[PDB]
């Protein structure tokens, strides 16, 4: 047991410590208003159920693009085994709209031990609650 990952029954893996997830998406191979493309490791790629993309304006208001309890998975592994987080996917076929270089473009990750299979006692489906983990956050002009 890595003691780092938070195992469970069947003695599998369903999530590590934040500092562990952060370290994987630590290396970004490419970022654009269409999606990331970092290099995520299979050991982690497993515990994650999806990502959450949001645009935080200079003042302080944050908009979640794929704001949905089930649109959470916008990731997908390729040929060269590189993960491409697809912003454009759940933003109705449109890429990210940044109207000001200083708006940040946060992208969170959700360990499976936090993922919600369905709504709640509020008939709510928002990405609030879902304990997310930031993994990337470059301003607007740092993106390009």
């Amino acid at each position: 047991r890595d003691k780092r990952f938070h195992y469970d029954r069947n003695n599998i893996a369903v999530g590590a410590d934040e500092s562990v997830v952060k370290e994987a998406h630590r290396e970004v191979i490419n970022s654009s208003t269409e999606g990331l493309l970092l290099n995520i490791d299979k050991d982690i790629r497993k515990i994650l159920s999806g990502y959450i993309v949001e645009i935080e304006d200079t003042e302080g208001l944050k908009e979640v693009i794929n704001d949905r309890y089930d649109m959470l998975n916008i990731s997908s592994l390729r040929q060269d085994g590189k993960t491409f987080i697809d912003f454009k996917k759940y933003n109705d076929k449109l890429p990210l709209y940044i109207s000001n270089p200083n708006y940040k473009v946060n992208v969170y990750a959700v360990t499976k031990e936090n993922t919600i299979i369905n709504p709640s006692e509020n008939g709510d489906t928002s990405t609030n609650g879902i304990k997310k983990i930031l993994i990337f956050s470059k301003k607007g002009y740092e993106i390009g």
Epitope: D57, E59, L61, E63, D92, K93, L94, Y97, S126
Partner: single-chain antibody, 227 residues
């Protein structure tokens, strides 16, 4: 149902240099997904603020949106002759999108080219045409909004030229038929079987970059219907 937007103050006048305030008011937490548009005097339509307070580039710093929950409001610090117009506030949380009723502001004392005005005999179809001239046609949606006095604005539907997917409104399920032609950047609506009811204007606002906001609007198309 349709999230019903309410603009209690239907109209107002105010000298220049005044701090005008236009207030919208949703019928259920729309969670910030609200935008404001200004309808100039020249029957045109400008996209101003999206997502409650983010200003569209170009808008003069003296504007500003506010709120959260079900009480959003535009505030025009020290008014200026070129701000006159009728402001609407379309929500954009849970489709179908629905606009307010407009708060006509007075003064107390062409990338999207639409078709020509139609005139039909009660019971005939028509085909209005939105002719985008820009470059982002098959890469940006196309919403068709319907304006008629007293009825703020009703979102009809939209199609995405680039592939063919489309969405409609419940009241217009059986009326409009959105068709588009990727080769000549053009959309077409087809109000089939008209009535004295359809007699209205029909703008064709294209929503590109912002699924819940139409940035460029056509000019309109007076589709009046006789007896």
């Amino acid at each position: 149902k349709d999230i019903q937007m309410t603009q209690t103050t239907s109209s107002l006048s105010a000298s220049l240099g005044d701090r005008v305030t236009v207030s919208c008011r949703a019928s259920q937490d729309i969670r910030n997904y609200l935008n404001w548009y200004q309808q100039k005097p020249d029957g045109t339509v400008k996209f101003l603020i999206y997502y409650t307070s983010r200003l569209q580039p170009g808008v003069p710093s003296r504007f500003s949106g506010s709120g959260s929950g079900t009480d959003y409001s535009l505030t025009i610090n020290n008014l200026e002759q070129e701000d006159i117009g009728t402001y609407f506030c379309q929500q954009g949380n849970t489709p179908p999108w629905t606009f307010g009723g407009g708060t006509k502001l007075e003064i107390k004392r062409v990338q999207l080219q639409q078709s020509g005005p139609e005139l039909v005999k009660p019971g005939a179809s028509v085909k209005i045409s939105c002719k985008d001239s820009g470059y982002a046609f098959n890469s940006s949606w196309m919403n068709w909004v319907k304006q008629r006095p007293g009825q703020g604005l009703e979102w009809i539907g939209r199609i995405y030229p680039g592939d063919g997917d489309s969405n409609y409104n419940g009241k217009f399920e059986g009326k409009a038929i959105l068709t588009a032609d990727k080769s000549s950047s053009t959309a077409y609506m087809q109000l089939s079987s008209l009535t004295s009811v359809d007699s209205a204007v029909y703008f064709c606002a294209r929503s590109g970059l912002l699924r819940y906001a139409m940035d460029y609007w056509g000019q309109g198309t007076s589709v009046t219907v006789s007896s």
